[PDB]
Prior knowledge:
- This is part of a larger assembly, with chains A, B, C, D and E.
- By secondary structure, chain B is α+β, with helices and mostly antiparallel strands.
- Chain B has helices at residues 26-30, 102-120, and strands spanning 38-41, 60-66, 70-79, 82-91, 95-97, 139-141, 146-148.
- Chain B is 15% helix and 26% strand.
- Chain E is 47% helix and 4% strand.
- One magnesium ion binds at residues 12-13 of chain A.
- Chain E: Belongs to the eukaryotic ribosomal protein eL18 family.
Amino acid sequence: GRRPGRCYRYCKNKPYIKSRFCRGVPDPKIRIHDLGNKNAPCVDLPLNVNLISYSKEQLSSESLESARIAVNKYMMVNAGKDNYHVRINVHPYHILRINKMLSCAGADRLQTGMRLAYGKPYGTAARVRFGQRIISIRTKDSNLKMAMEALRRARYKFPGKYEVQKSNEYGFSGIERSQFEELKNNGKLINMGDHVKIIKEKGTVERYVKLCENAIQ
Amino acid sequence: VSSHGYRRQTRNLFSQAFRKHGMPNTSTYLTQYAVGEYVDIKVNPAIHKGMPHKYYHGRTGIIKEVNRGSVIVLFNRILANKTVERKVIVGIEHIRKSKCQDEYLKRLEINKKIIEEAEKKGEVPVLFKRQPKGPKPAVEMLMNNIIELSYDKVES
Amino acid sequence: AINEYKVYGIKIDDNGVVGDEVYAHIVFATNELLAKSSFNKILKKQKKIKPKNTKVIKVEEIKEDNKDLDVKNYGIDYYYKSKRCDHKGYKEFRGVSRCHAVDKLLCDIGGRHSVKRNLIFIMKVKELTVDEIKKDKIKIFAMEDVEYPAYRNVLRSNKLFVSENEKLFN
Amino acid sequence: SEERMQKENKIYAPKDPHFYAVVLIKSPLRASNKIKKTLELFRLKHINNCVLVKNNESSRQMLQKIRNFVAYGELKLKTLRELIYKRGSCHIFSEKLNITNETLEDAFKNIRCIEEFIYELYFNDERFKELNNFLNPFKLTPPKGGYKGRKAKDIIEGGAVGNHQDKIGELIKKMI
Amino acid sequence: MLKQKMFEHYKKKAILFDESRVPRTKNVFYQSLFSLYKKVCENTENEIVHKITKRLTMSRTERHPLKLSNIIEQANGKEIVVFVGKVLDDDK
RNA sequence: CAAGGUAGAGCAUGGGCCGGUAUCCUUAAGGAGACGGACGAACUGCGAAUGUGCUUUUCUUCUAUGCAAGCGUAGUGGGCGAGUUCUGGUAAGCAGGACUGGCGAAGAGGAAUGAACCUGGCACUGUGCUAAGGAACCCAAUGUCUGGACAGAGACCGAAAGAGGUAGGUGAAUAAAAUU
Lengths: 217, 156, 170, 176, 92
Ligand SMILES: [K+]
Ligand SMILES: [K+]
Ligand SMILES: [K+]
Ligand SMILES: [K+]
Ligand SMILES: [K+]
Ligand SMILES: [K+]
Ligand SMILES: [K+]
Ligand SMILES: [K+]
Ligand SMILES: [K+]
Ligand SMILES: [K+]
Ligand SMILES: [K+]
Ligand SMILES: [Mg+2]
Ligand SMILES: [Mg+2]
Ligand SMILES: [Mg+2]
Ligand SMILES: [Mg+2]
Ligand SMILES: [Mg+2]
Ligand SMILES: [Mg+2]
Ligand SMILES: [Mg+2]
Ligand SMILES: [Mg+2]
């Protein structure tokens, strides 16, 4: 089976990516990144909660898949399908290697020991640094205690330290709640699904007019 | 393992800058050179004759001889813990006039005045040396308009 | 022991007195060199003048009177650096000087949070009357209502061995 | 002057001095060759040596390189006198000698007593090179009462190396 | 000022006799002659005397000989010429 | 006065992951998308610090008890380790490079003991002083003040995960002493 997680925890080697130089790589286990009500307008799900890293390490594609299932099952049972959106932010682009050796060692025609030791592709992982957002949720404001408990369950699937924290931002916009309301009133915002575009006094006038008739108000 | 051809390892060197491809400008061809000038080497990758070896790129030397479309420049180099002179042939498309003597030549122009007067009136020149920057100067201050500073920013 | 100083200084370039402003900073430190160090630190972080473009014109010590050693109440606003981040807080003390108040805070945080004195920053020091006191700790001593007996014994003599029949302590 | 200035609400700050004093606090035996060459150019060779240097941009960059070995700062007249009188000495070329009237008169045609020497050294900038290069490096003892902390830390950190500014006199006075 | 003073001192010390050198010959007539020049050097600064005294201490190979015509060629119009070595005939 | 493409920063040619409002194309599915998030040792539009070279003593500072062409001739051509960094490997007191000091060829005082760590480079004597590290006793020199801490704990010592006891900070309540 697989080697234990301690073999590939820290970021020892340079990035190594699937390319013309590196062939015969297996598919990653995680394939699905967004769950819940993906296309819900930015205004409809104001509360934002994140899992944040207090460590610098590699996360396997096997661990990411286990966390997805854990977080999703909880929200689906408790929030209902139409009330939430989950995103897993990190993608496993780095390739791990193994230098496979026989059990019945000591003497063979195969080149034994540390002769010609460069390894073959083994699996994949995501590389992560301090203060990074690993998993993110948006929901109704009623569901704070539910969202907290959902993210807690991910915390036991990864090596190292991670914290559940609540954001200042409106939704998956980058805008603080106070500022968002001040731009929403006064007509400056255009909806683009999970985020917003800000109107500015920059282009030709006939374009400015055509944008403003589309605003959220 | 690595190889040892004449243009080894020159992927970054010997490439044109962004939005600066093409042949050289007229000024390159209309510049006149003379023996004893200091000159500076920068290879143009588009011209394939008269290129020097990549060790000499970005180095400055002195013109020894002048020919129809090329120049011979003298350099020094350390090999086997000893100093060796080297005579490098370069085409005029790969060189520019060096700025390294600029200040010294200005200083010589001032010295050239004084050194004549020093025969007539004095006996020895004042010679106008440079001096490194000295201590911090003295100051007299009016003492209205005071500004206070404080650790008011808490930096959460 | 800790002292209070006030440092004054100006900007200079290739020529003198390039701005007509003068900047000031009150600081608690052990000596003048630790005072001058703090002045440089704040200038570089709140403005962008590095030492080579600065000159200090004056350093003065600030001193109180208090000939009768009268006891006063003080409140102090502070922050310190831990392993996590920077932590702000407020505490109240009693003493015969602002410096006496400040030396007691520095000792307290070192005792309670395991921090060296250079990682603690004083923001404000204020002298207070009895109606102003916020926290529980000093109020009983301020309202003049405390007496207690001695818990520690004290030696009578410097001799190492004494006769069984002598008095040993206090 | 201070009275006149205060009486019109103005501050006066004098020009920085023309020379610093440097003392070699800790051993250089494992420093790099680049450090050893810099110490040679300042004439420092053994522990507790002390020497005077021109305040100038070249000197200030040399000091930055060696700051972990040396204590440095500025010296007022009272301490300069105690140094020269108690530990001073001189040389002609390879002959080492005591500072006497005959030797001053020989070397510097117009300085005749040891008090005139100290006066010119402090107040005349344009003769500093000649006046300084006559004196040998001062050979001091370790400080009386020791050092308070690990001397290899910076003065700001509570050690003994770095810039002591106006306060080097206190270190030197324990070492004469 | 000082840089000149220094260099002018080095140039002088480069000319003067070393006084810790001595000729290796056991010839007492040669050792007599050296003693005279040595006692003159310590009472003078004149460069010709110092040069002569240094050359008496050099080896047989360092004291290479000259032919008569080459002396005249190098005499450059002077009347007296001096040479720490042996003068040979020129057949030409 | 030149040259440089690393750290950081970015994703405009090339490679390449997930989701998209209006609108558009068909279907009555899907596709495109004015955009957002995630990335490369052999991606670059921008770009350090440190290091390298050139000129000027007509540029500070040192310098003869110093440098030294030339001629003759020795030993050496198994290295190993520390700090900072890199490549292969699950790793290793593993194998292999780069930079600045060591042991080899280096004693003395200190880390109880230790090739390489801290202080600091040795002719032979005498009087004083300091370093590093110590100061109940072994063993030359030790005491004081303020907080924490009760575990056959600590001074010498292992992870993700956690409750209990106690000392403090900040933010929410309620309050007929306070409490959560
Ligand atoms: K196992
Ligand atoms: K074996
Ligand atoms: K090959
Ligand atoms: K790219
Ligand atoms: K790169
Ligand atoms: K040999
Ligand atoms: K050996
Ligand atoms: K050695
Ligand atoms: K021992
Ligand atoms: K060992
Ligand atoms: K004892
Ligand atoms: Mg590797
Ligand atoms: Mg190369
Ligand atoms: Mg051809
Ligand atoms: Mg050391
Ligand atoms: Mg000490
Ligand atoms: Mg990078
Ligand atoms: Mg070998
Ligand atoms: Mg040893």
